[PDB]
Design a protein around this ligand. Structure first.
Ligand SMILES: [Ca+2]
Ligand SMILES: [Ca+2]
Ligand SMILES: [Ca+2]
Ligand SMILES: [Ca+2]
Ligand SMILES: [Cl-]
Lengths: 113, 110
């Protein structure tokens, strides 16, 4: 995708206060949940109301999903190596928690309009 | 008056819920953000998982079998609930927070 930037997560990001910012809607966040690292929190700012697509792509076979809520609840839908949803979001800050329920592995996270 | 047993942050360390219709007390304070539990169904039926928040914070749960079947708690104010038909087997129930800190009670009703 033209201009898509790959950006690494920034640990410690295990709570909402410590969330890694997704600075725009054309970034691919790269993260890992190995061993005792079982939660990676992200945030993003919606500036224009509209449908946002959230897609987590597993790079390894493990049990991982996500939960979104506004600062002011949407769950990832697990389908094999993709965990996705589409949701109409109003302007404001959102908190996107990627967390595992089994195993260990790496993932990429794409939040798009 | 049964209580969770830390550390229970992963499924291999899950706190056993010994019986249905039995209240478990837990907390997710500060950097304790995950409490894993397990339970065993012996007869197929509808199970009603109910988490009661004792403080206002963002907490929910995720159920999966020991064997992509996954079920999420539905947040409604201070209750996080669902009803799911389960076949005999072992299940893992992850109670986790997404904001704040607080105490809760958990039941697997049947
Ligand atoms: Ca990580
Ligand atoms: Ca992390
Ligand atoms: Ca606990
Ligand atoms: Ca715990
Ligand atoms: Cl039973």
């Amino acid at each position: 995708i033209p201009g898509n930037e790959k950006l690494k997560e920034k640990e410690n990001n295990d709570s909402s206060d410590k969330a890694t910012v997704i600075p725009n809607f054309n970034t691919t966040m790269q993260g890992s949940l190995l061993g005792d690292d079982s939660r990676d929190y992200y945030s993003f700012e919606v500036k224009e109301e509209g449908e946002v697509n959230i897609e987590l792509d597993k790079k390894d076979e493990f049990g991982v999903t996500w939960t979104l809520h506004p600062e002011s609840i949407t769950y990832g839908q697990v389908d094999g190596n993709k965990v996705s949803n589409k949701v109409k979001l109003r302007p404001g800050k959102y908190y996107l928690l990627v967390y595992k329920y089994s195993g260990s592995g790496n993932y990429e996270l794409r939040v798009n309009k």
